[PDB]
Design a protein around this ligand. Structure first.
Ligand SMILES: [Hg+2]
Ligand SMILES: [Hg+2]
Ligand SMILES: [Hg+2]
Length: 185
């Protein structure tokens, strides 16, 4: 297990470089009447890390959050399920800030800064680590028809692992792939 607790910006550690070191329950979400009456979407955030990162820090390659987002006059977020690699019930999905406007025909266009978190327990070291994903999302909602369109991720996703932002040694992302498609776990 590498010691990742005393790092500085710019350092190389194994196959990685350190880019940064200072990381930045409503009843409504569980009421099928609210879900019926409001624009909502159920999505999976599927994260696949590169092998060299995953093996080095001893964190599994594939992490998934099953989430819901709901628009309710505003943007409400909830983790429904996580992949079995994350500590049970440790997943969180939070909206930090939101901007929106009416664009006519009863549509609203929005951008939000959101973050996912979860804990991972290493059974060899018996230590728990924190995974964080920051992203800026864009969407559109139509309250009358209850339509919620996810129009993509504009900033991020940016992964922090135990409060450190890594890149590969060659400056590329530690992420192999990600998706934020409709679905549930
Ligand atoms: Hg990880
Ligand atoms: Hg907010
Ligand atoms: Hg990670």
């Amino acid at each position: 297990a590498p010691d990742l607790t005393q790092l500085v910006i710019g350092q190389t550690i194994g196959p990685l470089i350190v880019d940064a070191i200072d990381e930045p329950a409503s009843d409504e979400l569980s009421d099928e009447k609210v879900i019926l009456n409001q624009p909502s979407t159920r999505r999976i955030f599927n994260l696949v890390l590169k092998d060299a990162f995953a093996k080095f820090v001893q964190c599994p390659k594939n992490i998934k959050w099953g989430v819901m987002m709901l628009w309710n006059p505003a943007l409400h977020t909830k983790v429904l399920e996580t992949s079995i690699n994350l500590v049970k019930k440790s997943g969180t999905f939070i909206e930090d800030h939101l901007g929106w406007k009416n664009v006519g025909d009863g549509w609203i266009d929005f951008k939000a800064n959101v973050r996912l978190h979860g804990d991972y327990y290493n059974s060899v070291t018996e230590a728990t680590s924190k995974i964080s994903v920051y992203m800026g999302i864009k969407g559109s909602v139509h309250v009358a028809t209850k339509e919620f369109i996810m129009r993509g991720i504009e900033t991020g996703p940016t992964v922090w692992y135990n409060g450190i932002r890594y890149q590969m040694k060659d400056g590329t992302s530690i992420i192999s792939s990600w998706s934020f498609d409709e679905g549930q776990l």
